[PDB]
Structure formats: C-alpha cells, structure tokens
A and B are shown apart, each in its own frame.
Chain A
Amino acid sequence: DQVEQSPSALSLHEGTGSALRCNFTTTMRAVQWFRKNRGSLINLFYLASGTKENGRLKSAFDSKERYSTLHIRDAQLEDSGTYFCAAEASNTNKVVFGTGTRLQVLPNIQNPDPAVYQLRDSKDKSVCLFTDFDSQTNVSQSKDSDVYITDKCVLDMRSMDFKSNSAVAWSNKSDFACANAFNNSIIPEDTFFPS
C-alpha cells in the first residue's frame, strides 16, 4: 500500500542539511514530494526524471534505480513538518504515498537566557512561562493531572531576526508556584527565577 521512506524522523540544527529518500519496489512513472506543517499538504516538486531545484530544496528521481531523494540545505525553522513522497506505479497507473518523514528543525540560540516568568490574567489567574533555553533542554510533562505543561514551541521574531523556545505551565492547585512548576524537567542550573 505504501512506499518505503527514510528516515522516519529527523532533527536538524538550523543551517545544516540532509537527504530524504523513497525506495520503490516497482517501476515508477513520476514522483511528487509534499510537506505538511495541522497545515496543508504543500506541493514541493513533481518530476518524471532527472532533478529539480528550488531555493534550498532539490529533488532527484531515477525510475530505473527505483529511488527518489529530496535534499534540504541550510535548514530553516519553516522547513519543519512532515514530508511525503508520492509515486505513480507504471504497471497500475495508481499513486502510492510514502510512509512519511517527520522533520524538526532546531533553532540556534545565540545567547540562551533560561528563565521562568509569572504572567497574570489580563482580566487572579496566572501561568508560568519557561523561555529562552537552548534546544538542548527538554520539557517534561507533569505527573499530576492538576498541572498542565505544554511541549516546547519555537517562535521567530522576524523584525529582529531572533528565535526562542518556550513552554507554558498552569494550575489551580493552591500549592502551585512558578518556582516549582517545571520541577519535573532538567532545566539549566542558571535558570532565572524572578522575585
């Protein structure tokens, strides 16, 4: 039903490169490459032979050799998402989709400034913001159902060419304070705890 695609998952630091591959078990007429970021499936390349190149991406297709590749160079945050190849088999004229590659691109934090901040409701409620840590830190979920902790998320302030990681944590339990919100995580020793 599916086409073998490699790798299954990939993490690249910004500015680096890698190659995604699909391996076919029959003769293919043409290949398409897509990328999905809950976003839509965006067409990257369609080709029946040789190669094609567009910006930082390049695709190649060898029907005879039974493979297609997609190269990413100078990886950017916006390259993140799930990539699929899709190929039309010559003997059926039907399209079969690759198993998919989940690509994560890690921003390169020039000057990490790990900190946990308390933020208050615009309208006695607050959340805690863990931010500005390097891609090396991992945020763990809480093991009590009463505290909520999101996975890390990278934002890019284009105007200032600045990128940063953060995760958010919140709770109702009166025992909850930002000082210990992320105790479940291994956070930098020099993490800033205001107040």
Chain B
Amino acid sequence: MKVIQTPRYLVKGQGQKAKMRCIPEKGHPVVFWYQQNKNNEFKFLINFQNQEVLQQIDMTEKRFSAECPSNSPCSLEIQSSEAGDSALYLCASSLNNANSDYTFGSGTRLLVIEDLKNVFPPEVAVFEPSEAEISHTQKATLVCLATGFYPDHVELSWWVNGKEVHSGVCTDPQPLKEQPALNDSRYALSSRLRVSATFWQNPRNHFRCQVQFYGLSENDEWTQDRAKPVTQIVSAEAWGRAD
C-alpha cells in the first residue's frame, strides 16, 4: 500500500548481484533499510533523507550499493551475494531521521544458494469437495495442493469467477518440506476454500487456485534440458458440479 517494495521474493546464486527496490510513502523523505533474520532480529543497514545518506554501518558501505535517486525508486543492491545474506529486507519510510513513526513495505525475502539448478516451479492441483462433506454439513471444501517447488517462494490465492476471494480461505502458514531431513528439498503447500454446498453445486461457478512462483528471470542463464524455472504463475481450477 503506502510503501511499495519489489520484488516480494528473490533467489540468487552465490556471487550474483541482488537488487531490490522501495517506493517510499509520498511526503515521507526518509527511507530506512532493515535486514530481519529468522529470529525476528531487526538489523539496521542504512537510511536516506531524499538522495543523501544519514546513517549506515560498515557492512552496508562495503557490501551493498544503495541510492535514492530523485523521482526514481530507492534501491539496495548486494554486489556479491553470499548465503549469509539470505534474510527479509524491509524498507520503511518516515518524516524524519528520528522521532517519527515508521511505515513498512511488504519486504523482499532474499534467498542465496549455491546452485540455481535446484530451482523448480510448482505443480498445482485442485481437489473437489467430497459428497460426504456436502451431505454431512451442507458445505463444500476445495483443496489446492502446490507441490515440487523450490525455493519456498510462492504466493497462493483463490479466484472465484475471475475475482480473488479471501472469505472461507486458509493457506498453510509455511510450505512443508517434501523431504525434511534433506537440504535443497523441494516444498509443498496446501490451501482450502470452503463455500456453501449450493454455491459449489452451481455449474456456472468457477474456482481457480493460483500460485505465483518467484524464480529465475530472463537475464538468468539456463543450459538445462528442462524448461527454464522462471518467475511464473501456475494454476489449477474446477467448475461447480451438479448433484
């Protein structure tokens, strides 16, 4: 909303550059960058007032390149990515260098890995409501499964009749490992969308589980036989069904 960060997820190989962008809330000239780890620690990196740097640390000064150009988005770039850079990068805007509230963007979740060869888009499937559930409860639960993906960088949504829905939906907080005791394991994620039986039983109603996967870009090289695992949407769907 107010603060717009892109991209929401990013995967890069060791030694590559990783660039992320932030558009501060209008009327707020100070932009802060934080790095948040899995332990919910917020590590201050650098801040700008308009085009000028106000405060920062040595690491950010040596390892990153950051700028807030006039009438362009702020950016923060890791010059040579390392495993230890994997984190959630948060941009906040504020009126001042101090004594003013922060407004945060959605962040950029960066993962840095050894080999992009392990990157895989998800397969997606929709499982239709059981008749037993319909008879037992007069409700109908659809289940979406996204499977075989890596890294765990996906956003799942439900679209009914071409409109995204939120009511009646629950998606797993975190994707699970298809092989837990294994690094580089691919992931799976499930979600449910529950509607009234009568709504499911209307063949004019259409249900789609959409998975936005974040993967490679065009500039990324790919010499593998399989399709280039690019950022992409994979969906599965079902129409309502009569008795």
Task: Give A residues with C-beta under 8 Å from B.
Answer: 1-2, 29-30, 32, 34, 38-43, 46, 82, 84, 86, 88, 93-95, 97, 99-100, 113, 115, 117-123, 125-127, 129, 131-132, 145, 148, 150-151, 153-160, 162, 164, 166, 168, 170, 192, 194-195
Give the contacting residue for B143; candidates A113, A129, A156, A194; CB below 8 A.
A129
Sample of 5 A–B contacts (CB below 8 Å) = A97-B40, A123-B125, A150-B172, A155-B192, A158-B167
Q: Shortest distance in angstroms between A169's beta carbon and chain B's nearest beta carbon?
A: 9
B136 cross-chain contacts in A, Cβ below 8 A: 113, 115, 192, 194
Taking a contact as CB atoms under 8 Å apart, the answer to whether A41 and B190 are in contact is: no
Please name the residue on chain A nearest to B191 by beta carbon. A153
Q: How far is the CA of A150 from the CA of B83 in the complex (A)?
A: 28
Please name the residue on chain A nearest to B105 by beta carbon. A40
Q: Which of B14-22, B126-134, B214-222 contacts A (4 or more CB under 8 A)?
A: B126-134
Give the contacting residue for B132; candidates A93, A121, A168, A195; CB below 8 A.
A195
Please name the residue on chain A nearest to B175 by beta carbon. A150
Q: Shortest distance in angstroms between A41's beta carbon and chain B's nearest beta carbon?
A: 4
Taking a contact as CB atoms under 8 Å apart, the answer to whether B102 and A155 are in contact is: no
Near A by CB (< 8 A), chain B positions 118-158 give 125-130, 132-133, 136-137, 139, 141-143, 145
B168 cross-chain contacts in A, Cβ below 8 A: 155-159
Q: A127-B127, A160-B196 are in contact. Are A100 and B143 (CB under 8 A)?
A: no
B44 cross-chain contacts in A, Cβ below 8 A: 94-95
Since A41-B104, A122-B237 are in contact, a sample of 13 more A-B pairs with Cβ atoms closer than 8 Å, ordered by chain A residue number, is A38-B173, A88-B98, A113-B136, A117-B130, A119-B142, A122-B126, A122-B236, A126-B127, A145-B180, A148-B188, A151-B173, A168-B192, A192-B136
Q: How far is the CA of A168 from the CA of B144 in the complex (A)?
A: 10
B126 cross-chain contacts in A, Cβ below 8 A: 121-122
B58 cross-chain contacts in A, Cβ below 8 A: none
Q: How far is the CA of A132 from the CA of B192 in the complex (A)?
A: 13
Q: How far is the CA of A1 from the CA of B193 in the complex (A)?
A: 42
Most chain B CB inside 10 Å of its own CB: which residue of A39, A132, A155:
A155
Taking a contact as CB atoms under 8 Å apart, the answer to whether B98 and A99 are in contact is: no
B169 interface contact, C-beta 8 A: yes
Taking a contact as CB atoms under 8 Å apart, the answer to whether B130 and A119 are in contact is: yes
Q: Shortest distance in angstroms between A175's beta carbon and chain B's nearest beta carbon?
A: 18
B171 interface contact, C-beta 8 A: yes
Q: How far is the CA of A117 from the CA of B167 in the complex (A)?
A: 21
What count of chain B residues pass the 8 Å CB interface test?
52
Q: Shortest distance in angstroms between B220's beta carbon and chain A's nearest beta carbon?
A: 24
Q: How far is the CA of A164 from the CA of B133 in the complex (A)?
A: 13
Most chain A CB inside 10 Å of its own CB: which residue of B97, B130, B133:
B130
Taking a contact as CB atoms under 8 Å apart, the answer to whether A84 and B133 are in contact is: no
Question: Contact flags (1/0) for B166-193 with A, using CB distance below 8 Å?
Answer: 0111111100101111000000101011
Q: Shortest distance in angstroms between B80's beta carbon and chain A's nearest beta carbon?
A: 26
Give the contacting residue for A145; candidates B142, B172, B179; CB below 8 A.
B179
B194 interface contact, C-beta 8 A: yes
Taking a contact as CB atoms under 8 Å apart, the answer to whether A43 and B102 are in contact is: yes
Q: How far is the CA of A160 from the CA of B90 in the complex (A)?
A: 37
B106 interface contact, C-beta 8 A: yes
Taking a contact as CB atoms under 8 Å apart, the answer to whether B98 and A93 are in contact is: yes
